[PDB]
Design a protein around this ligand. Structure first.
Ligand code: NDP
Ligand code: NDP
Lengths: 288, 287
């Protein structure tokens, strides 16, 4: 292995995928896992198995941590508190913005540099260009390791505050859960009349959602300008579709629990006298 | 010089329908409760019917594009003998029940009846990306589908006259989920003073585009009643949820729009089915 050394801490599904990709691109790859047996498949394709946290940290300057949660990351760090000096830690362990900031503070106090990353991909997609990985933390630190990290996917630096990658990650997941709420309600409705989901989804729902997804750029601009529009696809107009959806759902025996919240928000805005505004107005309503 | 059509209702959508029929050479008779709305159509060749009865008499294909089912019934009931041996194509939005009720009246008055759901705004009428759902007797639809094809892409969804409306409302339900997601995502980034436009254009839209394609695999699982074991399990989703909730709380963002799916996921995990995937949620809201 002729390329710059990397150590990977955590050899679950994701850490295994990261280590595999580093090895495939010729990096000297040292691996560590709390349960040491998980290293064996990687040893078989050229990984070096570190017997301790301390020796994994010593083997490389770039130390990737991909464990379960922030508590587990802290447990790893605290096991060898002098091992991190002059190292760059890239923490790809999911958590809150606060978790990233707290971990960074510890790392900085122990002589390490620290970047947080959020992997927007499943393990199988690591190493593909479609795998987006968000990163945040000091720009100069990121600059030093971004070429090595680019083996994993498309690097997307989102700023200096170390908690920002996690915020972007969780924002994207929130978007996905809305999409899945819509899928669930739509498919329940057609399934309630014995319509197969696959044909409906492939030929009607996906094309419709694709068209409506493009509308989001205009909404985003309105959010930024704090100018929610007048007439058109107003909230007054949306509030006219809602009773049909609710009544049809009730008649088909489909619960409205997943869609009722946005309908209640729309109705609140109408009742405040702002029915002429559009959907961009809803963002400020859920903010503090 | 082409086959006659009558359009009842000259709002934004009815005007667009009449305009497209005229552009494709159909003799187009128009009627509206407020007669002034006919004047622009007269100027491009429409015949203005003085009564509902005379609009019905002018054509075999009678398109009704009004506000709601009550308004459709008001039009029909004004001239109860006018509809015999005519094909009514009702493009007025409502519930499946509304379409069935209207069809029952039409059939009792000697008419044939198709319901359609326009998944498009008026200016898109006549374009291939305008999908129009239709339901009702297949043999009736056969007789009018070539004329109707000038309006958009015909999508026949079956015999039960309420099915076009069910498909339409299902699609809208999907959209409202998408908008719930947009709202929460953008609130979160805005709470940290991140501009929405850059985030949406370069991160959220590409991500949602990729997740939208994943819906085909979920749909297959729903149909097979086989919700998977491991992978992107509900157990895995239930680990992201507390991070989203805690970060939202810290940023002062209400979780009212996403809490319901999190509660459904948690219920399924607690029933011992955490190894199943998101396709399991469809059956949970059915009953
Ligand atoms: N899988 C996925 O699709 C995605 C995962 N992620 C994130 O990547 C990270 C890793 O996920 P994934 O690999 O799939 O999860 P796995 O459950 O497969 O692996 C979790 C890893 O964390 C380790 N770990 C748990 N507790 C501790 C501890 N106290 N001290 C040290 N190590 C510990 C495990 O060690 P041991 O083997 O000894 O149990 C294992 O290496 C998580 O933050 C996850 O949210 C990000 C995007 C997608
Ligand atoms: N426009 C859109 O973006 C979309 C509309 N649709 C559906 O198409 C239909 C028409 O929409 P659109 O034209 O845009 O709406 P408008 O408000 O522009 O038009 C409503 C029409 O209904 C008529 N109407 C209202 N009440 C009655 C009544 N009691 N008797 C007779 N006619 C009546 C109005 O007549 P008058 O001029 O006298 O007021 C007008 O012609 C609705 O079902 C709508 O949901 C479907 C897809 C999207």
């Amino acid at each position: 292995m002729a390329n710059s050394p990397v150590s990977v801490f955590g050899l679950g599904a994701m850490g295994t995928a990261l280590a595999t990709q580093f090895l495939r691109k010729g990096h000297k790859t040292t691996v560590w896992n709390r349960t040491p047996a998980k290293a064996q498949p990687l040893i078989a394709i050229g990984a070096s198995h570190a017997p301790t946290i301390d020796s994994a940290a010593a083997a490389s300057s770039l130390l990737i941590i991909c464990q379960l949660d922030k508590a587990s990351v802290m447990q790893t760090l605290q096991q060898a508190p002098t091992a991190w000096a002059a190292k760059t830690i890239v923490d790809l362990t999911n958590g809150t913005p606060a978790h990233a900031r707290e971990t960074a503070d510890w790392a900085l106090a122990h002589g390490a540099r620290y970047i947080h990353g959020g992997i927007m991909a499943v393990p199988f997609m690591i190493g593909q260009p479609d795998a987006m990985i968000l990163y945040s933390g000091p720009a100069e630190v990121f600059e030093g390791v971004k070429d090595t990290l680019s083996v994993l996917g498309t690097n997307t630096y989102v700023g200096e505050d170390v908690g920002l990658a996690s915020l972007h990650d969780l924002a994207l997941l929130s978007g996905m859960y809305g999409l899945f709420s819509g899928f669930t309600h739509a498919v329940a409705l057609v399934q309630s009349a014995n319509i197969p989901a696959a044909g409906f989804v492939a030929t009607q729902l996906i094309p419709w959602l694709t068209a409506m997804t493009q509308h989001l750029n205009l909404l985003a601009t309105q959010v930024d300008e704090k100018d929610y529009g007048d007439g058109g696809s107003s909230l007054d107009m949306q509030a006219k579709a809602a009773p049909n959806i609710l009544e049809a759902s009730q008649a088909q025996g489909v619960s409205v629990e997943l869609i009722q919240p946005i309908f209640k928000l729309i109705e609140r805005r109408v009742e405040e006298g702002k029915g002429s505004e559009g959907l961009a107005a809803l963002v400020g309503m859920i903010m503090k």
